[PDB]
Design a protein around this ligand. Structure first.
Ligand SMILES: COC(=O)N(CCCCc1nc(CO)c[nH]1)Cc1ccccc1
Length: 305
């Protein structure tokens, strides 16, 4: 109960370069993986069964995100585009063009009528899904944008940058609501809202995770013990069993913390390169983890708690 007991169930091989992200569909039936090999792969969430490859990007992919109804994906690519995909058909519906450098991060709003993107071009863009047109270009940061995420009602966007800032944006106007983290340094490598939209989980490249109260703009919790000085490693709120914080690490482990106590409650051993990305199953106590170039595999882990 008080600790999870995640154990390896499946290893998913198929990517020929570093995996860049993994995401479970909201309906829980699929895992989507993006890679430097320019491919998206779709896997059975429960049995890790390879479903299909989705291809079309001309260069490597840094991120993929699911629509709310689990019917679409958006990918962010070094080819300076995002692509919206129909998962069923595997077809590119739209190519989102406007970024002037690598597109690093992406997400749909809960309504799934918008996509938010972050680029090496230091901008955040908001896209209309239906038309594939850019609605707003936000001069968000003074260095590459590491993460973008909408809160639970779609009214807010949180961004992070190598400029060391975390900023929250009014979706409707694109105007800045507050700069949460305002330090020269270190680089903010990842941010996302908590499921209730009250808190922001932020990674910094000083081996630190911080849980911020958005309203008060104050740090509540710090999570340490893992290695993170180079890569934009995802972090998750695990909510299906015990309330954990989950992250990859440059020491090739998955770290699990107790959200409240900040104690490490498990380290998952198995990968042979940096764990860049972790995802938590929406219903079951299942973690997916993905590793860089030496490894190029995705691991599915299952816990009783
Ligand atoms: C600093 O850049 C990186 O973290 N990577 C890892 C892959 C992308 C991971 C990623 N996190 C996010 C956080 O929003 C989006 N995408 C790029 C990379 C790929 C392959 C080899 C070396 C570096």
């Amino acid at each position: 109960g008080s600790k999870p007991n995640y154990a390896l169930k499946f290893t998913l091989a198929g990517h020929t370069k570093a995996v860049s992200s993994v995401k479970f569909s909201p309906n829980g039936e699929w895992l989507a993986s993006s890679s430097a090999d320019k491919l998206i792969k779709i896997w059975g969430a429960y049995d890790g069964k390879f479903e299909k490859t989705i291809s079309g990007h001309k260069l490597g992919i840094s991120d993929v995100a699911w629509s709310s109804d689990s019917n679409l994906l958006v990918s962010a690519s070094d080819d300076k585009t995002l692509k919206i995909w129909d998962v069923s058909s595997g077809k590119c519906l739209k190519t989102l063009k406007g970024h002037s450098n690598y597109v690093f991060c992406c997400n749909f709003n809960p309504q799934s009528n918008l996509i938010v993107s972050g680029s090496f071009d230091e901008s955040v863009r908001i896209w209309d899904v239906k038309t594939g047109k850019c609605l707003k270009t936000l001069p968000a940061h003074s260095d590459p944008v590491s993460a973008v995420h909408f809160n639970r009602d779609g009214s807010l966007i949180v961004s992070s940058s190598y400029d060391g800032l975390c900023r929250i944006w009014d979706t409707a106007s694109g105007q800045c609501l507050k700069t949460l983290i305002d330090d020269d340094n270190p680089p903010v490598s990842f941010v996302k809202f908590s499921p209730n939209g009250k808190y922001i989980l932020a990674a910094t490249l000083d081996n630190t995770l911080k849980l911020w109260d958005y309203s008060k703009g104050k740090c509540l919790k710090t999570y340490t013990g893992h290695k993170n000085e180079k890569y934009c490693i995802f972090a998750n709120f695990s909510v299906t069993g015990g309330k954990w914080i989950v992250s990859g690490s440059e020491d090739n482990l998955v770290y699990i913390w107790n959200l409240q106590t900040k104690e490490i409650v498990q380290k998952l051993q198995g990968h042979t390169d940096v764990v860049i990305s972790t995802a938590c199953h929406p219903t079951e106590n299942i973690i997916a983890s993905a590793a860089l170039e030496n490894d190029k595999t995705i691991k599915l882990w299952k816990s009783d708690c």
